[PDB]
Amino acid sequence: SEESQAFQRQLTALIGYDVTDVSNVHDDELEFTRRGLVTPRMAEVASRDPKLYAMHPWVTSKPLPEYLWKKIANNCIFIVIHRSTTSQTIKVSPDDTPGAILQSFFTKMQDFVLRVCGRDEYLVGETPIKNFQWVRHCLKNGEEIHVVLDTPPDPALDEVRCDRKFRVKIRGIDIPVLTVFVEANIQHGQQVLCQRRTSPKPFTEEVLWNVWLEFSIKIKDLPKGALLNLQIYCLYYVNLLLIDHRFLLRRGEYVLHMWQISGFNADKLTSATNPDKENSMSISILLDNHPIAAEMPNQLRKQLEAIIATDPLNPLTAEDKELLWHFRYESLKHPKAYPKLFSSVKWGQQEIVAKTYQLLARREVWDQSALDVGLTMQLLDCNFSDENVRAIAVQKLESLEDDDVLHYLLQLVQAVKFEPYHDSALARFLLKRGLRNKRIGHFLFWFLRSEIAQSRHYQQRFAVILEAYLRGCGTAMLHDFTQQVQVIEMLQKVTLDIKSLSASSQVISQLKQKLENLQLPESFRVPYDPGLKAGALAIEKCKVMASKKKPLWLEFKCADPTALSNETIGIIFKHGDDLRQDMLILQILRIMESIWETESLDLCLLPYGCISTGDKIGMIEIVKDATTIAKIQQSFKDEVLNHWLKEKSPTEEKFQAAVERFVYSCAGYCVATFVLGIGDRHNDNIMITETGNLFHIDFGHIERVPFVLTPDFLFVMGTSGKKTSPHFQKFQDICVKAYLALRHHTNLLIILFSMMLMTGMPTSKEDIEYIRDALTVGKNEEDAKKYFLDQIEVCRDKGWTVQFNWFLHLV
Numbered sequence: 143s144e145e146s147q148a149f150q151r152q153l154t155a156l157i158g159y160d161v162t163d164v165s166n167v168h169d170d171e172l173e174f175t176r177r178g179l180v181t182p183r184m185a186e187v188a189s190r191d192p193k194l195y196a197m198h199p200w201v202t203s204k205p206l207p208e209y210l211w212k213k214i215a216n217n218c219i220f221i222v223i224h225r226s227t228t229s230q231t232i233k234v235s236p237d238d239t240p241g242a243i244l245q246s247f248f249t250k251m252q253d254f255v256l257r258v259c260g261r262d263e264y265l266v267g268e269t270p271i272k273n274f275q276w277v278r279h280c281l282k283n284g285e286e287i288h289v290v291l292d293t294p295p296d297p298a299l300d301e302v303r304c305d306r307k308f309r310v311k312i313r314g315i316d317i318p319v320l321t322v323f324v325e326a327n328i329q330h331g332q333q334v335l336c337q338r339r340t341s342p343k344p345f346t347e348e349v350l351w352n353v354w355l356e357f358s359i360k361i362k363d364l365p366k367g368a369l370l371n372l373q374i375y376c377l378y379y380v381n382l383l384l385i386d387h388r389f390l391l392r393r394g395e396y397v398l399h400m401w402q403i404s405g406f407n408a409d410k411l412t413s414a415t416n417p418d419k420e421n422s423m424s425i426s427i428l429l430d431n432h433p434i435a436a437e438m439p440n441q442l443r444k445q446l447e448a449i450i451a452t453d454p455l456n457p458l459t460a461e462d463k464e465l466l467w468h469f470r471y472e473s474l475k476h477p478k479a480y481p482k483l484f485s486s487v488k489w490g491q492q493e494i495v496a497k498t499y500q501l502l503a504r505r506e507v508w509d510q511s512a513l514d515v516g517l518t519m520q521l522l523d524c525n526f527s528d529e530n531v532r533a534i535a536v537q538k539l540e541s542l543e544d545d546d547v548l549h550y551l552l553q554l555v556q557a558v559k560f561e562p563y564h565d566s567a568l569a570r571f572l573l574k575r576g577l578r579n580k581r582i583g584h585f586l587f588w589f590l591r592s593e594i595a596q597s598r599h600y601q602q603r604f605a606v607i608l609e610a611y612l613r614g615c616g617t618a619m620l621h622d623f624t625q626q627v628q629v630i631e632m633l634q635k636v637t638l639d640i641k642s643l644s645a646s647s648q649v650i651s652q653l654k655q656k657l658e659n660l661q662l663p664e665s666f667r668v669p670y671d672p673g674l675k676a677g678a679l680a681i682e683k684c685k686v687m688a689s690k691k692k693p694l695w696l697e698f699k700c701a702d703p704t705a706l707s708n709e710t711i712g713i714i715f716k717h718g719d720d721l722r723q724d725m726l727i728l729q730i731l732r733i734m735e736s737i738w739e740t741e742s743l744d745l746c747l748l749p750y751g752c753i754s755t756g757d758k759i760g761m762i763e764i765v766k767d768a769t770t771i772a773k774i775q776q777s778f779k780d781e782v783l784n785h786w787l788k789e790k791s792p793t794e795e796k797f798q799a800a801v802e803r804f805v806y807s808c809a810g811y812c813v814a815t816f817v818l819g820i821g822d823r824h825n826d827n828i829m830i831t832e833t834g835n836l837f838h839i840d841f842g843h844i845e846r847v848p849f850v851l852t853p854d855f856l857f858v859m860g861t862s863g864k865k866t867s868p869h870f871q872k873f874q875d876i877c878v879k880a881y882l883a884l885r886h887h888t889n890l891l892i893i894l895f896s897m898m899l900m901t902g903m904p905t906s907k908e909d910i911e912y913i914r915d916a917l918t919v920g921k922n923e924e925d926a927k928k929y930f931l932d933q934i935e936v937c938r939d940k941g942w943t944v945q946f947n948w949f950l951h952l953v
């Protein structure tokens with residue numbers, strides 16, 4: 143169809159990659175997955191309620207935290223309602239359903255719905271008012287809930303239209319420009335089954351061996367998902383699945399173009415070949431050589447328990463693995479032992495694998511066990527290639543409500559890189575949950591699109607998954623995405639053009655002019671906050687920041703007239719940094735906020751919105767009324783920070799609340815940063831709001847100091863490096879309370895941290911340990927409770943020693 147060709151082009155401009163192209167495939171894995179990602183799509187699309195899908199209500203089935211209970215005194219909630227400059231307040235009970243509120247309101251005077259004023263956010267569905275996120279947001283922030291009664295959005299325009307051994311031939315290598323040898327492996331889950339090599343020849347434009355590298359593994363022994371790893375060093379690598387998606391073995395000859403090093407990493411596992419054929423190193427290989435689906439003594443059981451108890455970081459001895467394996471059925475009764483057990487499997491042996499799959503038959507204990515996202519994630523990392531082991535983990539995620547899928551959505555999207563094949567249980571899980579919820583689908587869009595734009599190694603796999611989502615999300619979503627992408631390209635253009643014109647009066651004139659040139663969509667959704675829409679630019683408020691990379695400071699008008707405030711939406715555009723690192727960290731900070739919601743804690747973290755759009759290019763949310771701690775100091779005497787708060791405080795009451803939130807916010811970042819090992823930062827990278835909320839920024843690429851707690855912060859808490867103030871005791875306990883709450887989620891944090899380094903960093907093995915030592919693994923609470931207080935003292939014993947040094951390095 144002529145219309146289908148123009149439609150596919152819409153998806154191509156949206157996705158930023160052409161899926162129909164078959165220039166860089168040696169097989170049909172991609173296309174087969176497209177055909178295979180039609181059934182799952184239609185299955186979720188044909189099974190979704192248009193009404194609830196069109197308004198995409200954001201809710202949680204979790205209990206309301208202890209601290210958020212104090213906010214409600216009379217067991218009633220105030221819901222200000224709007225129709226046209228008219229206000230009708232309604233005192234309401236925490237359990238009052240949105241429907242009841244509609245009739246309970248009309249009585250004081252049922253076709254319409256309560257929409258949040260100035261937002262594409264609705265309060266609809268059989269849910270208590272207390273369970274809506276926008277409601278919990280207002281309580282936490284003291285704001286009141288303003289709502290407008292409007293027609294429920296039309297779901298109409300959401301609609302979609304042998305026993306022989308193995309061998310391989312190393313013919314040679316070829317690079318057009320610029321002692322090197324070949325290294326061939328057979329890997330399953332980053333675990334080497336066998337390794338062969340060649341003879342070192344001098345580095346030149348042409349070096350060939352044509353050697354026959356023989357393997358010890360046998361044809362029926364080869365596990366599904368097994369990769370053929372080919373490497374070269376004196377610095378190039380490529381892979382290829384020994385088994386395709388149809389259970390067929392690799393028959394034929396292959397010319398493969400290789401990736402190069404820039405000096406473990408998610409990229410090293412990719413089954414995709416290098417797109418650039420003009421400059422890349424190539425490999426010559428040929429392959430010519432199907433499948434189907436008494437108890438322990440308590441002394442050994444005690445040893446097995448000790449092994450199960452240890453962390454995910456603790457390596458497994460050959461002694462342990464044999465113990466875990468010989469006692470499979472005792473190990474099966476402990477879900478926490480599944481990662482270590484499946485690591486004890488000889489995947490290079492068909493007879494054992496069969497025992498493995500047979501073992502997975504009766505998963506009575508696994509399927510009944512409470513979901514452990516830390517335990518589930520472990521089965522999804524680089525150390526597991528078995529399609530069925532991963533399937534039981536993805537099976538467990540399905541119980542997750544949309545609320546929790548949002549918290550872990552970024553890590554899940556990244557975990558796709560660890561999948562041996564393009565079509566996986568995980569990729570189908572992401573697709574289902576994306577098509578089932580508009581908010582999940584919105585972020586799934588930008589997460590996929592961030593990788594597709596700056597990742598040569600995986601852009602193909604993600605493009606196919608993004609295409610499968612674009613069809614099925616709806617005609618309405620497609621319009622928004624088109625607008626959003628349209629604006630970001632115009633802004634990124636301006637951002638890049640502005641950056642080059644500077645290493646002034648000249649640039650400031652160039653900015654306003656080029657901004658007046660765009661004058662382009664009338665409105666678009668904010669990528670990091672889909673509820674908000676943006677209008678025309680506040681060109682007068684727009685400016686290039688006095689920062690080293692010349693970042694664009696932009697402000698927009700809100701396109702919603704139903705908004706009480708007149709505030710502009712601020713966004714920063716930056717080409718200097720790699721905002722992928724920032725995304726992961728910020729998302730981990732949100733996960734930390736959730737964990738502290740478990741023990742009923744608020745630390746007032748400010749995980750501002752951040753989205754990577756291209757290569758070292760993206761956007762950051764602007765937190766209103768925030769300034770840098772450094773800027774407060776210059777234009778290092780201690781009392782400065784306190785003068786600022788009282789200055790920005792209209793009343794003495796405002797000041798006290800600003801001091802309170804500072805004690806919490808400071809405590810939150812002190813604990814969070816030290817764990818992630820990013821505690822040592824300069825003043826410029828730590829900001830504060832006029833309302834007392836402290837927060838950090840710029841998380842890309844990171845003597846000594848545990849974390850930042852300078853004398854000015856101490857002074858705002860009223861302590862001169864020796865005494866203990868009333869607020870300081872509050873802070874010093876809050877740190878311990880919050881630090882103990884994270885040790886309880888050690889495995890979850892480690893696995894997240896481990897994945898963040900592999901899929902989001904450029905070795906990899908030793909770097910992970912800091913979070914293990916920081917979390918004080920294998921130590922009682924009190925001894926650990928002191929370890930953190932000792933870390934606080936190292937900040938007191940220090941002062942500006944490193945902070946002054948930081949001032950020295952930049953200059």
Ligand SMILES: Nc1cc(C(F)(F)F)c(-c2nc(N3CCOCC3)nc(N3CC(CO)(CCl)C3)n2)cn1
Pocket residue numbers: 687688689691693714716719720721724750762763764765766768769770773829839840841842
């Ligand atoms: N990777 C990055 C990059 C930046 C960058 F480019 F500097 F803007 C930031 C950043 N975020 C932020 N904030 C994000 C949250 O809302 C407040 C602004 N501010 C600032 N600036 C302080 C400034 C120079 O001194 C003028 Cl006020 C510019 N920088 C964070 N992470």
